[PDB]
Here is the input.
Amino acid sequence: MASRILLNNGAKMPILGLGTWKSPPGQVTEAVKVAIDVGYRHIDCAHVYQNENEVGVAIQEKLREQVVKREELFIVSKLWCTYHEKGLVKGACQKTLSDLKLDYLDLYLIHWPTGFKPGKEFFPLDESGNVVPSDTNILDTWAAMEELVDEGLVKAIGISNFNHLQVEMILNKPGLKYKPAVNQIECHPYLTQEKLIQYCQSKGIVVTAYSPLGSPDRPWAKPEDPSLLEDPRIKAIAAKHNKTTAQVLIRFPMQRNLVVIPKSVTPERIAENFKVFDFELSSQDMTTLLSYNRNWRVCALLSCTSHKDYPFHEEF
Ligand SMILES: NC(=O)c1ccc[n+]([C@@H]2O[C@H](COP(=O)([O-])OP(=O)(O)OC[C@H]3O[C@@H](n4cnc5c(N)ncnc54)[C@H](OP(=O)(O)O)[C@@H]3O)[C@@H](O)[C@H]2O)c1
Ligand SMILES: O=C(O)COc1cc(Cl)ccc1C(=O)NCc1c(F)cc(I)cc1F
Here is the structure.
């Protein structure tokens, strides 16, 4: 299987990338350096992760060392919810570019479909704990994203955590100039996303699977939640293939024509997670993994559930 997938902007995107949410700022520079040294060419970032400066130090060092050329890297970031307004989008993108020490992003995503009140706080709340919306809509935010392409700041634009109706709304936008290249969504054997993936793929939108290992370090994990990495059924498939459970969990979305972005700051795991191009899951393995769906989400957030554009009320 090829290492990159063709996007609807004509550029190629590596199907395996390194995630950076929760990567501590004192560890992520080395994580990204190691990743690039062992073959990663795609890094998934976001302003809200609060570590783009440190990610950028690694990228810049590897560019300066001439380990890789800029054209060989595929750097992704995301516009946070408090920057959905027309007059804030460019500055938000530029702050990310400055922190990452880049002059363009390969892909810039609307992180969530919901706009929040601008200000210092990433999650502005009312006194009862509800997020405070902005009156921005996904269509006007999209137009602002299109401007970034036309200004040379980003090579591609896309969306993240958009449900099927929201994807449809973008595709049906009056005067749409650029289609979204990517929809980045949670996807793993407990949240298999058949409906939304089929819709996006049918429209030429590439899907990136986040939390492919079930995000065991998510800060709201409860001791009781289901655990992909410990599921004996998945362990059995891994054993059959002489691979680790994580390697199976990474290979799974790859064979569905998805991009996948496992996170690690552990050098041995960063390397392990990349060793997924020399084995194949059978069709029976794939269908068996799909059968584990339980509609379980890592990424949901009560404080945001009443926002008009919160994505997870719809079935898909
Ligand atoms: N667009 C969005 O809204 C959104 C939401 C969630 C995630 N994402 C992106 O997707 C990335 C991945 O998702 P995620 O961070 O939620 O979780 P994940 O990649 O599913 O899991 C990361 C966890 O798995 C551990 N791990 C990594 N490789 C392992 C291995 N080979 N064996 C055992 N454990 C391993 C990591 O530990 P160590 O790091 O300690 O090694 C970390 O605790 C994020 O970092 C972010 O870039 C985007
Ligand atoms: O959104 C991500 O990329 C990962 O999740 C988070 C990352 C940070 Cl730095 C802070 C918060 C979260 C988080 O709570 N994510 C879940 C979440 C939202 F942040 C925002 C919405 I709108 C819905 C939702 F489920």
